[PDB]
Amino acid sequence: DYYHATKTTIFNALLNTIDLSQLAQLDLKQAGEEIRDIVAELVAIKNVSMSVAEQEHLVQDIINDVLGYGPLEPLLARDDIADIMVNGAHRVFIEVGGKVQLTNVRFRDNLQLMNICQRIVSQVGRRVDESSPICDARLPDGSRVNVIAPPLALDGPTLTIRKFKKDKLTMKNLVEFASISPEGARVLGVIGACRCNLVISGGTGSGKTTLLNTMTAFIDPTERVVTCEDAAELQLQQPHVVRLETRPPNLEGSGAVTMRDLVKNCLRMRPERIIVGEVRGPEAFDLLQAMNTGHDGSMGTLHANSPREAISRIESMITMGGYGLPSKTIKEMIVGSVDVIIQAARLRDGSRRITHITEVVGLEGDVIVTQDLFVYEITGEDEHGKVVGKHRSTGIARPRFWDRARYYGLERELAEALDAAE
């Protein structure tokens, strides 16, 4: 109690003594040193008995509550904590060891919490307030910060800080979860490093966005990637990624920036890969042009339950584009652009699998001929109801993209993986 009362009195005296504007004009170190000196002077004036270590701790706490992020500062400092969820000024949960636990950490009130949220978002230039209550940002260290303002959040401002978990979205997870056999994982790595044009089609609940993240994990760091997403969820580890997001039309139906506009602009930014979050309309056309215009390596997710259905869907969107393109022209465009199609599906037992890794071999007259490098064969189920299956390589020793692997020097890895898969 004595420590809390002393801290409250010292903070009140400092606030009444130093104008926040002057500190705002000074760097963090200078402001912190000045605040420490002022707090020491205030403690001397008030004649508060405290140890040197206790005084330093109180000064650091005051600085954090003034300049830093207040009570969150220890939590952010800790590394075991993965996520921080502040629901109003009085409830703070932390995700430790994969489980969410309530914490005794509390804020002074919703005003201090809102100030801390505003500081955190502004750290990257974003602004949150009643005019713009919802804010979502990605801090330079990879952490994701989401803030909701009191007008929308009944119980006060809400803040979610998800620290970056590097190892969650990795091909190791897919291999261990049996989503893809190790040989399939190696072939997928080859495909990603070969700059093959990918279309990651999947059914509902197949988690093809996680698969797209896993595939983007293989992009060479030097390549200038550009990602278009309706609602940004990809997290690429490469250092030269440009992140874009479509703007939905306002309630008057104006100001929309559709995915097609984003991809069209992406064509003019000198990118090396274009990663469309999900293709649902005419953007397909544009994406395919990007795949054919020279930005080989572009990826894109798609809603379809089989590679053939994915091709049909792509044709349907291109036709929806409104251009007078005959079906044969669209089929030729698809064959020219797309290299590999990866079909991921959620099986009967709710488990995710990469059912197909297939190749768009060509166009026979009017039928797009595709060959499957890898397939998932279901052979039964467990007594638990779990589905039993195995990933089998079709045995195609020379996929159409073998030349790209040879050019990049990955031919040997590709051949080894294909032989091992059998």
Q: Which positions from 195 through 214 interact with ligand ADP, judged by CB under 6 A?
A: 202, 205-210
Q: What residue ranges in 365-404 does DSSP mark as E strands?
A: 367-381, 387-393
Q: Is 348 in the site for its own copies (CB under 8 A)?
A: yes
Do the annotations mark residue 362 as ligand-binding? no
Q: Is 208 in the site for Mg ion (CB under 5 A)?
A: yes
Q: Is 371 in the site for its own copies (CB under 8 A)?
A: no
In this complex, which beta carbon is closest to its own copies, that of residue 166 or of residue 270? 270
Q: d(Cα 238, Cα 244) in Å, to the nearest integer?
A: 15
Work out which of 35, 62, 67, 148 binds its own copies, going by CB under 8 A.
148
To its own copies, the closest distance from the beta carbon of 199 in angstroms equals: 15
Q: Is 192 helix (H, G, I), strand (E, B) or coil?
A: helix
How far is C-alpha 101 from the geometric centre of its chain's CA atoms? 24
Q: Is 231 in the site for its own copies (CB under 8 A)?
A: yes
Beta bridge partners of 302: 201
Give burial (CB, 10 Å; 0-12/13-18/19+) of 303: middle
Do the annotations mark residue 205 as ligand-binding? yes
In this complex, which beta carbon is closest to Mg ion, that of residue 163 or of residue 186? 163
Total residues at interface with its own copies (CB under 8 A): 122
Q: Is 355 in the site for ligand ADP (CB under 6 A)?
A: no
Among Mg ion, ligand ADP, its own copies, none, residue 85 binds (CB under 5-8 Å by kind): its own copies
Q: Is 344 in the site for its own copies (CB under 8 A)?
A: no
To ligand ATP, the closest distance from the beta carbon of 353 in angstroms equals: 7
Do the annotations mark residue 383 as ligand-binding? no
To ligand ATP, the closest distance from the beta carbon of 204 in angstroms equals: 4
Do the annotations mark residue 278 as ligand-binding? yes
Give burial (CB, 10 Å; 0-12/13-18/19+) of 308: middle
Of 72-80, 201-209, 305-313, 332-340, the window that binds Mg ion (rule: CB under 5 A) is 201-209
Do the annotations mark residue 233 as ligand-binding? yes
Which residue carries 């993965």 as its tokens?
82
Long-range contacts, 314-318 (Cβ 8 Å, 24+):
314/199, 314/279, 314/284, 314/288, 314/338, 317/279, 317/280, 317/281, 317/282, 317/283, 317/284, 317/285, 318/282, 318/284, 318/285, 318/288
Q: d(Cα 171, Cα 44) in Å, to the nearest integer?
A: 59
Of 56-64, 100-108, 172-180, 258-266, the window that binds ligand ADP (rule: CB under 6 A) is 172-180
Closest by CA position to 284, among listed 308, 259, 267, 304: 259
- Which residues of this protein are in contact with Mg ion, per CB under 5 A? 208-209
- Which residues of this protein are in contact with ligand ADP, per CB under 6 A? 174, 177, 179, 202, 205-210, 352
